[PDB]
Amino acid sequence: AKLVFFAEAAIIGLMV
């Protein structure tokens, strides 16, 4: 899985 750093603002990382 890759670490996607999303910016929803709240920056959030996701292990996809």
Side-chain angles (χ1 to χ4, degrees):
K2 65 179 154 200
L3 276 47
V4 196
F5 278 109
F6 282 89
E8 299 308 338
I11 177 171
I12 260 97
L14 297 179
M15 185 185 69
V16 189

mmCIF file of all heavy atoms in Angstrom:
data_model
loop_
_atom_site.group_PDB
_atom_site.id
_atom_site.type_symbol
_atom_site.label_atom_id
_atom_site.label_comp_id
_atom_site.label_asym_id
_atom_site.label_seq_id
_atom_site.Cartn_x
_atom_site.Cartn_y
_atom_site.Cartn_z
ATOM 1 N N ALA A 1 0.848 -1.221 0.000
ATOM 2 C CA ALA A 1 0.000 0.000 0.000
ATOM 3 C C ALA A 1 0.878 1.265 0.000
ATOM 4 O O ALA A 1 1.976 1.286 0.557
ATOM 5 C CB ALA A 1 -0.915 0.011 1.231
ATOM 6 N N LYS A 2 0.361 2.355 -0.653
ATOM 7 C CA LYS A 2 1.093 3.613 -0.717
ATOM 8 C C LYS A 2 0.479 4.648 0.214
ATOM 9 O O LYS A 2 -0.719 4.620 0.488
ATOM 10 C CB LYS A 2 1.129 4.153 -2.148
ATOM 11 C CG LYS A 2 -0.220 4.535 -2.725
ATOM 12 C CD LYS A 2 -0.044 5.073 -4.136
ATOM 13 C CE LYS A 2 -1.291 4.896 -4.983
ATOM 14 N NZ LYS A 2 -0.968 4.976 -6.433
ATOM 15 N N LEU A 3 1.318 5.561 0.696
ATOM 16 C CA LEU A 3 0.885 6.630 1.587
ATOM 17 C C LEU A 3 0.452 7.823 0.746
ATOM 18 O O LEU A 3 1.287 8.500 0.137
ATOM 19 C CB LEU A 3 2.003 7.021 2.548
ATOM 20 C CG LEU A 3 2.135 6.167 3.809
ATOM 21 C CD1 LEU A 3 2.098 4.671 3.498
ATOM 22 C CD2 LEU A 3 3.410 6.534 4.555
ATOM 23 N N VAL A 4 -0.851 8.073 0.709
ATOM 24 C CA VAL A 4 -1.387 9.247 0.040
ATOM 25 C C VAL A 4 -1.696 10.297 1.098
ATOM 26 O O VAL A 4 -2.463 10.043 2.026
ATOM 27 C CB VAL A 4 -2.649 8.906 -0.784
ATOM 28 C CG1 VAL A 4 -2.951 10.019 -1.772
ATOM 29 C CG2 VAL A 4 -2.489 7.567 -1.501
ATOM 30 N N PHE A 5 -1.078 11.466 0.973
ATOM 31 C CA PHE A 5 -1.360 12.590 1.864
ATOM 32 C C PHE A 5 -2.438 13.433 1.276
ATOM 33 O O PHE A 5 -2.170 14.249 0.319
ATOM 34 C CB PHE A 5 -0.085 13.452 2.067
ATOM 35 C CG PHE A 5 0.795 12.799 3.162
ATOM 36 C CD1 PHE A 5 1.976 12.182 2.824
ATOM 37 C CD2 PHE A 5 0.359 12.840 4.551
ATOM 38 C CE1 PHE A 5 2.750 11.607 3.801
ATOM 39 C CE2 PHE A 5 1.123 12.268 5.518
ATOM 40 C CZ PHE A 5 2.313 11.649 5.185
ATOM 41 N N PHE A 6 -3.654 13.286 1.789
ATOM 42 C CA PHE A 6 -4.792 14.059 1.307
ATOM 43 C C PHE A 6 -4.948 15.350 2.094
ATOM 44 O O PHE A 6 -4.571 15.421 3.260
ATOM 45 C CB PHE A 6 -6.083 13.242 1.406
ATOM 46 C CG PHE A 6 -6.244 12.223 0.316
ATOM 47 C CD1 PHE A 6 -5.738 10.945 0.463
ATOM 48 C CD2 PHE A 6 -6.910 12.543 -0.855
ATOM 49 C CE1 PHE A 6 -5.891 10.006 -0.535
ATOM 50 C CE2 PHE A 6 -7.065 11.607 -1.857
ATOM 51 C CZ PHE A 6 -6.554 10.337 -1.697
ATOM 52 N N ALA A 7 -5.512 16.367 1.447
ATOM 53 C CA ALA A 7 -5.828 17.644 2.083
ATOM 54 C C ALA A 7 -7.333 17.857 1.962
ATOM 55 O O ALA A 7 -7.815 18.365 0.944
ATOM 56 C CB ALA A 7 -5.048 18.789 1.446
ATOM 57 N N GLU A 8 -8.072 17.470 2.995
ATOM 58 C CA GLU A 8 -9.527 17.543 2.968
ATOM 59 C C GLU A 8 -10.025 18.852 3.558
ATOM 60 O O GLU A 8 -10.235 18.970 4.765
ATOM 61 C CB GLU A 8 -10.131 16.360 3.723
ATOM 62 C CG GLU A 8 -9.766 15.014 3.130
ATOM 63 C CD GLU A 8 -10.068 14.936 1.644
ATOM 64 O OE1 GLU A 8 -10.918 15.718 1.170
ATOM 65 O OE2 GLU A 8 -9.452 14.103 0.949
ATOM 66 N N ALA A 9 -8.431 23.369 5.872
ATOM 67 C CA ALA A 9 -8.625 21.933 5.558
ATOM 68 C C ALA A 9 -7.687 21.041 6.404
ATOM 69 O O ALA A 9 -6.628 21.463 6.864
ATOM 70 C CB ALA A 9 -8.375 21.686 4.067
ATOM 71 N N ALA A 10 -8.122 19.756 6.603
ATOM 72 C CA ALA A 10 -7.346 18.802 7.379
ATOM 73 C C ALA A 10 -6.493 17.928 6.469
ATOM 74 O O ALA A 10 -7.020 17.136 5.690
ATOM 75 C CB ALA A 10 -8.271 17.937 8.230
ATOM 76 N N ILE A 11 -5.171 18.087 6.547
ATOM 77 C CA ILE A 11 -4.276 17.183 5.833
ATOM 78 C C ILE A 11 -4.298 15.828 6.522
ATOM 79 O O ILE A 11 -4.140 15.730 7.747
ATOM 80 C CB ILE A 11 -2.851 17.752 5.755
ATOM 81 C CG1 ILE A 11 -1.918 16.741 5.075
ATOM 82 C CG2 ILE A 11 -2.320 18.083 7.137
ATOM 83 C CD1 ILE A 11 -0.536 17.283 4.750
ATOM 84 N N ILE A 12 -4.496 14.778 5.737
ATOM 85 C CA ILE A 12 -4.697 13.436 6.262
ATOM 86 C C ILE A 12 -3.926 12.425 5.411
ATOM 87 O O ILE A 12 -3.954 12.513 4.181
ATOM 88 C CB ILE A 12 -6.217 13.096 6.318
ATOM 89 C CG1 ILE A 12 -6.765 13.284 7.739
ATOM 90 C CG2 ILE A 12 -6.516 11.683 5.767
ATOM 91 C CD1 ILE A 12 -7.434 14.627 7.977
ATOM 92 N N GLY A 13 -3.233 11.470 6.036
ATOM 93 C CA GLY A 13 -2.578 10.444 5.259
ATOM 94 C C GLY A 13 -3.278 9.284 5.271
ATOM 95 O O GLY A 13 -3.870 8.932 6.256
ATOM 96 N N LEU A 14 -3.273 8.582 4.142
ATOM 97 C CA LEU A 14 -3.990 7.317 4.026
ATOM 98 C C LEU A 14 -3.100 6.210 3.473
ATOM 99 O O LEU A 14 -2.415 6.395 2.470
ATOM 100 C CB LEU A 14 -5.219 7.475 3.127
ATOM 101 C CG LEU A 14 -6.322 8.424 3.599
ATOM 102 C CD1 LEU A 14 -7.445 8.460 2.577
ATOM 103 C CD2 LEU A 14 -6.862 8.022 4.963
ATOM 104 N N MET A 15 -3.116 5.060 4.138
ATOM 105 C CA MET A 15 -2.445 3.872 3.626
ATOM 106 C C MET A 15 -3.440 3.029 2.837
ATOM 107 O O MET A 15 -4.108 2.158 3.391
ATOM 108 C CB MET A 15 -1.837 3.048 4.760
ATOM 109 C CG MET A 15 -1.031 1.855 4.270
ATOM 110 S SD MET A 15 -0.429 0.786 5.585
ATOM 111 C CE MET A 15 -1.953 0.057 6.180
ATOM 112 N N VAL A 16 -3.533 3.299 1.544
ATOM 113 C CA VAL A 16 -4.304 2.805 0.413
ATOM 114 C C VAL A 16 -3.669 1.512 -0.083
ATOM 115 O O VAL A 16 -3.096 1.456 -1.173
ATOM 116 C CB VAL A 16 -4.389 3.857 -0.703
ATOM 117 C CG1 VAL A 16 -5.380 3.423 -1.768
ATOM 118 C CG2 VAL A 16 -4.787 5.212 -0.128
#
